[PDB]
Design a protein around this ligand. Structure first.
Ligand SMILES: *[C@@H]1O[C@H](CO)[C@@H](O[C@@H]2O[C@H](CO)[C@@H](O)[C@H](O)[C@H]2NC(C)=O)[C@H](O)[C@H]1NC(C)=O
Ligand SMILES: COCCCCCCCCCN1C[C@H](O)[C@@H](O)[C@H](O)[C@H]1CO
Length: 751
């Protein structure tokens, strides 16, 4: 009855899978079985499996202040003192090179994957420790974590570790003796080791910290000895069927390099000189492929801009993760419920975040990935489409497994089945259609019922008060602490909308996403021969493209822009009231139904998504507000909100700083650049002005992102509209990677 609808919200969609039957098994995808699929860990690997084999690195500098134990490094915590760091090279498949700056130390973490056998092949790591341009004493830790009943067989001094799993068969792990960098001659190292049952992945750091409780002596030949904190000096199992954890510690004076090798039984050497040769061959092949794909040198980009592009791509491919588990869901009508267990293969917005998937970020990530490797995009889109419930909903934030949950109470992990997110997954679909590649076409043929179910859910679940209008569900519940209720499902969290939320609201950005989605899917339906779907999608796209209805619903003549509508008053302020603290004060005039004055990214949506005809009477006015220094035009790109707005740089609460209230964001700037490139290249009365603004905006965005990367070593979440400085989270790779597509002038066109 009502309980049948609840189970529907918590059931996987019955349509055919967009991915082959056992898509992640090494029999089907051998090249992708192993990888750097744990983005929140500085350096580690895992298999694309629900019961994976995990590896990782930890490090600590010895000679630290007493009473105060050394800082142990393992996960990418934004305030741990490490930085800058990031991938210089990573092709998302065979190799990678990363640099980590940590106080007096510089670390180089490199890997090469070698195919062979029936279980996903082999891999080798090289970790180089050098002093910052001092011979500091350093401990490196190399661990392995098994699943359930799987056991490890050591080879004692600790030479190697052998194992067996259903998915990997027989395998061997070897920690080779250290050498000096660029040489094969062995150097003396001190060894410690810990071995017991796996305490859980978010508990590895604390378990190691707890067992670094006894002093030892590093005794190299021809040198004075050094004291260090370590794990037990000899191998002894410590006393539940939750898998095993074995961590090996190596300590000596920098500079040195140490190799950690994985060898598959079925594949039966990638070490020293052969590993050095493999690394150089991979780096050269990467550079050749990068120029052919993006043609930056041919397009006249500087060597510095070329280096920026290379890092933009490497950081994005380096942040691709594999997740498995049950998410928390709140059905629309109630208590939270578990969703069925599912896998997810996806890019992440920041390595500094708990390892999670974000729905509208992924559409932007895949625009970059598809240009480099179309197969990776098919894998990622196929996995996101596997998350649909029987109604066509996908949770906007995917928190799957223990590390992703990261000790946050379940109350803050729950995804609401009533709430949406922009359908940016359709943007890489436009490019796949344009290229007419047979593999992309065969994938889209299989994926069509899922893409259609998901789109249909969006315009039906978010229907507005009148025909052809839409309203984002999930605006914050009006509280005395909130200046303006946020719209978290829209992606632009604190962009100002109506002061007093109600069911009479009409949202401009959402209407525009629906118009684009209907157009993209009608084009796909026509290409595939989906007659009945095309007969529905075609007329819906035309009804939403139409200028009369858009004008009636969103054109605000008193504002000279397109706007959101609702019960609103500009007379709202945050004021301190003892004993209350800082609270919102509604003054005069009282709220009434009208268009909302909030000139910014939302105002531009018919232009950004290329919905206006080149001869539209509304195109000129939008171009003028975009170009105006008093509004959106800053020397570093387009502002999220007008500098003349009463909400400009305004905090929403005592604990909530401005977010989409002035700062420059690279995803929306990329869409504006695609739109200006479009209007500047088609015939029309504003072609000249659009072509000019395109060149000026491109120059400003590229320059600032390049300069901030030079000054900080990072690509940031957002940029200051006043001085261009990187702000928010970092590394943000992440849609800030779109800077590569801006430099290459690669924009997907849906006309
Ligand atoms: C716009 O918002 C105002 C402010 O909340 C609404 O006024 C409230 O209306 C309800 C229902 O009549 C009353 O119980 C409250 O006392 C009113 N509050 C105040 C402070 O006047 C108003 O109804 C809303 N208008 C529309 C069209 O939704
Ligand atoms: C310590 O790790 C914390 C991990 C979880 C953070 C959860 C909050 C996500 C904030 C980041 N970000 C806010 C933007 O306004 C959205 O448009 C965007 O989709 C989203 C994801 O990039």
């Amino acid at each position: 009855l009502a309980w049948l609808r609840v189970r529907r919200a918590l059931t996987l969609h019955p349509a055919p899978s967009a991915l082959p039957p056992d898509s992640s098994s090494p029999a089907v995808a051998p090249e992708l079985f192993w990888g750097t699929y744990r983005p929140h860990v500085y350096f580690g690997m895992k298999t694309r499996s629900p019961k994976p084999l995990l590896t990782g690195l930890m490090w600590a500098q010895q000679g630290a202040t007493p009473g105060t134990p050394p800082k142990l490094r393992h996960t990418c915590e934004q305030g741990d003192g490490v930085g800058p760091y990031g991938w210089e090279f990573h092709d998302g498949r065979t190799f990678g090179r990363q640099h980590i700056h940590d106080g007096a130390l510089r670390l180089t973490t490199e890997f090469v994957k070698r195919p062979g056998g029936q279980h996903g092949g082999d891999w080798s790591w090289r970790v180089t420790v050098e002093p910052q341009a001092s011979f500091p004493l350093v401990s490196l830790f190399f661990y392995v974590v098994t699943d359930g009943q799987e056991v490890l067989l050591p080879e004692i001094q600790l030479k190697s570790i052998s194992g067996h799993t259903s998915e990997l068969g027989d395998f061997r792990l070897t920690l080779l003796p250290p050498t000096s960098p660029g040489d094969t001659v062995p150097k003396h190292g001190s060894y410690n080791v810990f071995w017991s049952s796996n305490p859980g992945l978010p508990q590895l750091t604390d378990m190691v910290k707890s067992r670094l409780n006894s002093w030892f002596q590093h005794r190299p030949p021809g040198a004075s000895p050094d004291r260090y904190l370590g794990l037990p000096g000899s191998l002894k199992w410590e006393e539940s069927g939750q898998g095993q954890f074995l961590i090996q510690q190596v300590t000596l004076k920098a500079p040195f390099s140490v190799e950690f090798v994985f060898e598959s039984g079925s594949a039966a050497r990638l070490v020293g000189s052969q590993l050095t040769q493999a690394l150089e061959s991979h780096a050269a092949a990467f550079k050749e492929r990068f120029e052919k794909t993006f043609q930056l040198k041919e397009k006249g980009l500087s060597p510095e801009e070329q280096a920026l592009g290379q890092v933009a791509l490497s950081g994005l491919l380096g942040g691709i993760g594999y997740f498995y588990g049950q998410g928390l869901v709140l059905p629309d009508t109630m208590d939270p419920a578990l969703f069925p267990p599912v896998p997810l293969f996806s890019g992440v917005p920041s390595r500094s975040f708990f390892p999670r998937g974000f729905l509208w970020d992924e559409g932007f990530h895949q625009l970059v990935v598809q240009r480099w490797d179309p197969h990776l995009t098919r894998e990622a889109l196929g996995h996101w489409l596997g998350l649909l419930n029987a109604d066509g909903w996908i949770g906007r934030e995917q928190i799957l497994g223990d590390e992703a949950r990261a000790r946050v109470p379940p109350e803050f992990l729950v995804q609401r089945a009533a709430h949406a997110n922009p359908p940016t997954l359709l943007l890489p679909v436009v490019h796949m259609l344009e290229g007419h590649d047979p593999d992309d076409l065969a994938f889209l043929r299989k994926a069509f019922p899922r893409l259609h179910a998901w789109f249909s859910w969006l315009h039906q679940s978010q229907a507005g008060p009148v025909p052809l209008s839409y309203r984002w569900r999930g605006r914050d519940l009006a509280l005395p602490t909130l200046l303006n209720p946020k719209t978290l499902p829209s992606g632009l969290d604190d962009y100002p909308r109506a002061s007093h939320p109600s069911t009479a609201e009409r949202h401009l950005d959402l209407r525009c996403w629906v118009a684009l989605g209907a157009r993209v899917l009608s084009q796909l339906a026509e290409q595939l021969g989906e007659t009945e779907a095309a007969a529905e999608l075609g007329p819906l796209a035309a009804s939403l493209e139409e200028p009369g209805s858009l004008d009636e619903l969103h054109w605000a003549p008193e504002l000279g822009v397109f706007a959101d509508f609702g019960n609103h008053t500009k007379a709202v302020q945050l004021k301190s009231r003892p004993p209350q603290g800082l609270v919102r004060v509604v003054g005069r005039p009282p709220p009434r139904l009208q268009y909302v004055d909030a000139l910014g990214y939302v105002s531009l949506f018919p232009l950004l998504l290329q919905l206006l005809d080149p001869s539209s009477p509304r195109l000129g006015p939008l171009l003028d507000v975009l170009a105006d220094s008093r509004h959106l035009w800053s020397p570093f790109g387009l502002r999220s909100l007008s500098a003349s707005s009463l909400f400009y740089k305004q905090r929403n609460t005592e604990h909530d700083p401005p977010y989409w209230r002035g700062a420059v964001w690279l995803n929306i700037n990329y869409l504006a650049l695609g739109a200006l490139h479009h209007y500047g290249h088609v015939e029309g009365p504003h072609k000249v002005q659009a072509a000019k603004l395109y060149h000026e905006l491109r120059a400003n965005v590229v320059r600032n992102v390049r300069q901030q990367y030079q000054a900080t070593g990072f690509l940031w979440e957002q940029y200051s509209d006043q001085d261009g400085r990187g702000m928010g989270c970092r590394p943000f790779q992440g849609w800030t990677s779109l800077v590569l597509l801006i430099m290459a002038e690669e924009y997907a066109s849906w006309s």
